[PDB]
Amino acid sequence: AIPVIITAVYSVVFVVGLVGNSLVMFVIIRYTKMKTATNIYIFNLALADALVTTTMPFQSTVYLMNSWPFGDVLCKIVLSIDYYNMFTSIFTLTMMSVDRYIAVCHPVKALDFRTPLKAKIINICIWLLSSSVGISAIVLGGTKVRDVIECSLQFSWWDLFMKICVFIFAFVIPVLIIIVCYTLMILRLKSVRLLSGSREKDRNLRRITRLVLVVVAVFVVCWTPIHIFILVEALGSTAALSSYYFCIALGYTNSSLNPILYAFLDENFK
Amino acid sequence: QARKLVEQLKMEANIDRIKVSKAAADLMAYCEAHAKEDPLLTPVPASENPF
Amino acid sequence: ELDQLRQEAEQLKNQIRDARKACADATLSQITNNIDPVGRIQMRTRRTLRGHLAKIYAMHWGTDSRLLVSASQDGKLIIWDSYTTNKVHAIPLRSSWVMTCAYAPSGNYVACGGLDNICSIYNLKTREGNVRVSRELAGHTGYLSCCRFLDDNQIVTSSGDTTCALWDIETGQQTTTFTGHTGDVMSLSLAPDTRLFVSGACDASAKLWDVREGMCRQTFTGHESDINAICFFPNGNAFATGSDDATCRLFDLRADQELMTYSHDNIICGITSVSFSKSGRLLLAGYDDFNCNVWDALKADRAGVLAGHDNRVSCLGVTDDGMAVATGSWDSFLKIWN
Amino acid sequence: VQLVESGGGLVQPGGSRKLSCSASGFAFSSFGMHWVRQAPEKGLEWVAYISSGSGTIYYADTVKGRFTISRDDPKNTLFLQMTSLRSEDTAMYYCVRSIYYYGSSPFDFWGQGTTLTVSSDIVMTQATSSVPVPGESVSISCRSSKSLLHSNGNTYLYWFLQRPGQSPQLLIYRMSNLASGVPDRFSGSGSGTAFTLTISRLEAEDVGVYYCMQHLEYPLTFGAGTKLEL
Amino acid sequence: VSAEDKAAAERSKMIDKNLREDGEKQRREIKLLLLGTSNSGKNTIVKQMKTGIVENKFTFKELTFKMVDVGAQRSERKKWIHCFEGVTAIIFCVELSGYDLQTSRMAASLKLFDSICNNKWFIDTSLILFLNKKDLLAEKILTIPEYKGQNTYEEAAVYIQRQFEDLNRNKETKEIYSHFTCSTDTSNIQFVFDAVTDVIIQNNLKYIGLC
Ligand SMILES: COC(=O)N1CCN(C(=O)Cc2ccc(Cl)c(Cl)c2)[C@H](CN2CCCC2)C1
């Protein structure tokens, strides 16, 4: 047949992802809303992931029919929303990792830094930093033409940048500093009582280590192939669209699995 | 001492005690005579209520 | 030798019990059984008061029924405006481990005290525009659990050294010392005519003292645990106690015995505060189960429930006008209810 | 409590001048502060107001755009800049402390003023200007343009007495309350638009000019004044 | 709203700002209670860092300590021990030279420890356990009924720590930090530093939902 119906993963990842954030906002209104920094970090991450999840049919239609048959403003709006909330989700993951590292390895200064007002101004700065990519996607985008109509970053060496740029500022720096933050956090918890005693303390420590390993693994497996394909198709020259839409399907799978790992495994919800 | 401890309690032993019927009647009379002046019995109208 | 003392004491205590049983011709419930019940008091919160960052242990209203002072563990005595939710004053305390605060009837001074064994008197209506420490009263061995104002120059204090005290504020000296309790004294309430006062302690005992000659006029013993709160009826002839045995009990002075009990099987937690309404019909008691209960004082019925605090309710207060009830708890908030 | 005002003098028209007032003997930062001037042969006139923490600053209509009021609480000083001075600014300026909470007594202390020689609103009418008076009882009437009874049941009228050669001092605040340091023989009573001050058993240190001031809305307006003479 | 009511509201806002500024400063501090005995060494520990309640403040490596001592209370403990429900740690002082000194010192020490460590308010509060008279146990000798051990040094103090840690019921939620006191060096407060740091992380993990 054809490996198109197998891209029905653009549904199961889709709806659950929306559901994954649909139950998230209720946690703000059915529990402690903003008394802790972690709660508002979870709230911004859930909102960003829901807005990433909103643009599913705008790629499933481009895959299903090999063209973008909508208007120019729809192309600009959808692409800007995609880039904006992608960067927002990545930076929110990064700052939750930094917050856990600060709470563990610099705990005396965490009495001052881990203020809800400071977390609010950091979140506002994160959304404002992603607004750069959002606005630059608004002004530099558009729909091209060839019997098919195509939506991309229409402006070539200018497309080597803003591809290597999103690779550098959206993949490598966040993954490196979350890896450093989590490995230093685990090395600190290795020598902490009520976690290195007997009975269930080592079990709790190994549970924390398993959570660290699974969040790092989910991030790398759900954001490496997209970047690899983007770089090797910007540099190098039927199966290409199929593999590319499996990769960005995994990029959506991150938005599905992210509120699970960062909300349901949190022990402060109930 | 024990002498003072028994002397004070014997001094307070001999007092004039009315019955419980008089006490209940007095409490009933006091609560009935000041019921209209109690804002917490019935909810006051919002015009005359500062809250 | 000492044989006569114990025998004589138990004999005259037994005849005190015999006279008390002779004077119990009926009960309060039998007389009040033909009263139309009050019903359900669904009093709701009108103001919430934010600004305290630690738990509140005491409050006391004003005579004008608009200002109220509150004491918390963050070293703060806050004087509020109930009508507008306005902070009139914020007094930083020298010691943050306070359990009691009082407001003078003249409105010119406030009092505070706690684990520091000192009753502090602060002056409000003074020059320089700031509240200043006017008096420090020392001489108690235990912590200061309650304090109430007689006049601008007389105060009465209850402490955890089994004693009460009457101080003259201007000279700062012990005018009278009230002795006789065996356990630590927790609560205090003055009669409206300012001549007698009842005091409740940890020996499960309430004691009625006369202010003039400093003598224990009466002693009432019915409870099984530590009495934490005590309050006079508006008449001045009866009083009500709350203890850690999850019961309130209403005593009479002239009858010299207990009149009524206020308990339920589904409440197993103690009582931190007790108060009456203006007419004395409604007895409001703060419990440890995050709620305040409203009993009918004549019929022993749970008339109402104030449930707005998510921590231990610590202090209650009913205005002299009877318009509202303020409730302070351990969740750093205190609310006005009507 | 001391409010010593300096900086005044003789200035040619079209100039600028810096008035200052040093405050001592009280917590200066807890008080809102007022500038009120008086013409050489006329009554009082409100000029400016600054709040505690310098949050609210209000000016009169005849000084807006050219007068500035400021304060420094570490130095405990109040400041008034005046620019493009007119001949109508020739007055003696008083610096007044006032505090606002429930039961407060604003306009309680008035400073020793400083001289400056430059060479919709509610109307308070004090019709009588000379009432002869001894051990007698006197009554001074003041009238309004709109009612001073606010919706909170508080009537917003103040009564000051200015003895000859002395700064005015607060007699009555909020139309009925008698200030500290004032004998009980003063009484203030009034209803909407119509007010009176009754002095029973007049004695020495009662001779002066009596002023009624409203405090509903800025600008604060005085009456013309009524003089009691022997 | 009238002019004076507006100014009163402005004063209330200023008081709110001052209250928040004081609350942050009282939130950056750490409260610990000394709860040993007058025959234990509570006063020596507090004075080595350099009637009524006493309360000492001193900052060690950007951590302000609010050390409260309640040793002058001849009243019932159950009526004021709830005032210390949310303290950071409990410091408990025990004299090793107490079994053969003044009567029932060791029994009083274990009884007070069993009262405090198993108290309802301190169900999750860690206890810092100081063992004093380290230089006096070596010259006092247990020789005084169930020891069955030798009477030399470097094991009697271990026996005392085992006796005090055996009273710790309901484990896997709280930790006893044991330390022999050295009255010459500063190693007393460093340990008080380190234990408190181990508290904060143990709090912070809960605050970040990882524990
Ligand atoms: C980091 O790698 C990138 O630079 N990417 C960011 C933008 N992405 C797009 O596919 C743009 C786009 C085109 C057409 C349409 Cl209809 C839309 Cl909604 C979006 C990729 C990733 N997104 C889309 C799927 C999950 C998030 C790759």
Author numbering:
A (entry chain A): 57 to 202, 206 to 214, 220 to 301, 306 to 338
B (entry chain D): 11 to 61
C (entry chain C): 3 to 340
D (entry chain E): 2 to 120, 124 to 137, 139 to 235
E (entry chain B): 5 to 54, 183 to 233, 240 to 279, 284 to 286, 289 to 355
Quote from the publication.
KOR is a highly desirable therapeutic target for treating not only pain but also addiction and affective disorders. Specifically, opioid receptors primarily couple to the Gαi/o family (Gi1, Gi2, Gi3, GoA, GoB, Gz and gustducin (Gg)). To further understand the role of KOR–G-protein coupling and signalling, we determined the structures of KOR in complexes with four representative Gi/o subtypes (Gi1, GoA, Gz and Gg) at nominal resolutions of 2.71 Å, 2.82 Å, 2.65 Å, and 2.61 Å, respectively, using single-particle cryo-electron microscopy (cryo-EM). The overall differences between the four structures are subtle (root mean square deviations (r.m.s.d.) of 0.5 Å), with the exception of the Gα subunit in each complex.
GR89,696 is a potent and long-lasting KOR agonist that produces antinociception and dysphoria but with unknown hallucinogenic properties. For example, GR89,696 in KOR–Gz also forms H-bond interactions with Gln1152.60 (2.8 Å) and His2916.52 (3.3 Å), and, in KOR–Gg, Gln1152.60 (3.9 Å) and His2916.52 (4.0 Å). This suggests that GR89,696 leads to more contractions of the ligand-binding pocket in the presence of Gz compared with Gg. One exception is that C351H5.23A in Gαi1/oA/g or I352H5.23A in Gαz led to a significant decrease in potency for momSalB or GR89,696-mediated G-protein activation.
